[PDB]
Design a protein around this ligand. Sequence first.
Ligand code: ZN
Length: 31
Amino acid sequence: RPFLCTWXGCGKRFTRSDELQRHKRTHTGEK
Ligand SMILES: [Zn+2]
């Protein structure tokens, strides 16, 4: 399952959901 970040134009795709969760932390708040 392509765990793709759907924030704005930040279409970064991940292989593991933890990677996407980790990544999403960047958008969730200031840094
Ligand atoms: Zn993103």
